[PDB]
């Protein structure tokens, strides 16, 4: 009819916005966790270098 189509369009705009936000948040999590794990690896290498210096 008439109002039904507009209501469906609203329900679809919510769909697109929610899905896009979810995808963007997932990409953010991937990037942040990669950052953290690379920092942890750098910390490990520093520990090993400290061990060599102690030797």
């Amino acid at each position: 009819m008439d109002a039904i189509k507009k209501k469906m369009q609203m329900l679809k705009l919510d769909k697109e916005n929610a899905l896009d936000r979810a995808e963007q948040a997932e990409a953010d999590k991937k990037a942040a966790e990669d950052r953290s794990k690379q920092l942890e690896d750098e910390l490990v290498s520093l520990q090993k270098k400290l061990k060599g210096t102690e030797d």
Binding site: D20, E23, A27
Partner: protein, 371 residues
């Protein structure tokens, strides 16, 4: 006073005062002289019915559009259309109102100069300004970046913009549009027996295209499905009865957009000219253009195009970038809404081409600083 935001277009003239939400009067731009003889005396028969009046008497007229592909090919008819638009559809004399026409990118200069000369000499407006049809569609979306694909009825053009700085070397204008799709649909309908030839029946084929055709998500699968089942055959009642049944002509007509080889055009579809237009841009603004792809114009109203185009671009683009296609529900009038917004701005109020300036430099003023 208020400004008149006219928008010539090619197929539908949209006009209205600046500052509203929708154009006041929207009517086809056709001027049709009668072609038969006429025997009743005193019937008050005019010599040319323009606008929406000639879509009701089209049975005995020969409608002919005055704008072929963006450019204007018949200046007398265009002047008649403008006169009708000002005096009968808006009823405001042009002597007291600025005007804001719109023009496709990469159009011949003489067209624009003649347009401004007409507006200043015949209608005698106070001041007029010509704007590119894609920047307005970008205004209406409320963005400031993004690459807009404005697939009108005359010509499809693809203007990329970043941070308000247009990139003049990356505009890809293609002349496939709604009219060629109407002609191709009228040409493939003949495969079932329905022959439309008269210039009046082109309107009927246009109505069929608007109401029935849709863009397939995957072309080969749809071609295979329509050739086995019969779940697609939708029927439609002509202006006199004799219903017709459209089979796989439904998604083959608008498929021409993505494969212009159907109508013999060499160029690539609207799915690949956008990617080419992006790749001509600099390497650092490609992510933003990927994320803010804007659709506009009438012909982008086919049901299911915002998904097919996204699938195609995602296939072409690198896998990491996010591809998003902005398809507002008010697509058809997006250019005019943007025009209203632009005309309502205070910062823009000193960019009009004032009449005294035209008197001093002639019609070639439009190419000058007042663009």
């Amino acid at each position: 006073t208020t400004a008149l935001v006219c928008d010539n277009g090619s197929g539908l003239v949209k006009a209205g005062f600046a500052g509203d939400d929708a154009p006041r009067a929207v009517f086809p731009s056709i001027v049709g002289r009668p072609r038969h003889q006429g025997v009743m005396v005193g019937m008050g028969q005019k010599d040319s019915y323009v606008g929406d009046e000639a879509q009701s008497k089209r049975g005995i007229l020969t409608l002919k559009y005055p704008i072929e592909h963006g450019i204007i090919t018949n200046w007398d008819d265009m002047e008649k259309i403008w006169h009708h638009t000002f005096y009968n559809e808006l009823r405001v004399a042009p002597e007291e109102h600025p005007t804001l026409l719109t023009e496709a990118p990469l159009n011949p200069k003489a067209n624009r100069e003649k347009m401004t000369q007409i507006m200043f000499e015949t209608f005698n407006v106070p001041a007029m300004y010509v704007a590119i049809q894609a920047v307005l569609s970008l205004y209406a979306s409320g963005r400031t970046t993004g690459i807009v694909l404005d697939s009108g009825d005359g010509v499809t053009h693809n203007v990329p913009i970043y941070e308000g700085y247009a990139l003049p070397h990356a505009i890809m204008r293609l002349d496939l549009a709604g009219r060629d799709l109407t002609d191709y649909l009228m040409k493939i309908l003949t495969e079932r027996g329905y022959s439309f030839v008269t210039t009046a029946e082109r309107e009927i084929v246009r109505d069929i295209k608007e109401k029935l055709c849709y863009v397939a998500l995957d072309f080969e699968n749809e071609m295979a499905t329509a050739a086995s089942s019969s779940s697609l055959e939708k029927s439609y009642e002509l202006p006199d009865g004799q219903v017709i049944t459209i089979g796989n002509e439904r998604f083959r007509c608008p498929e021409t957009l993505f494969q212009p080889s159907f109508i013999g055009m060499e160029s690539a579809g609207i799915h690949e000219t956008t990617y080419n237009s992006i790749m001509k841009c600099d390497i650092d603004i490609r992510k933003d253009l990927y994320a803010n792809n804007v659709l506009s114009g009438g012909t982008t109203m086919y049901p299911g195009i915002a998904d097919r185009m996204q699938k195609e671009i995602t296939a072409l683009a690198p896998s990491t970038m996010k591809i998003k296609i902005i398809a507002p529900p008010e697509r058809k009038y997006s250019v005019w809404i943007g025009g209203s917004i632009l005309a309502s701005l205070s910062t823009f109020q000193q960019m009009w081409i004032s009449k005294q300036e035209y008197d001093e430099a002639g019609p070639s003023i439009v190419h000058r600083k007042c663009f």
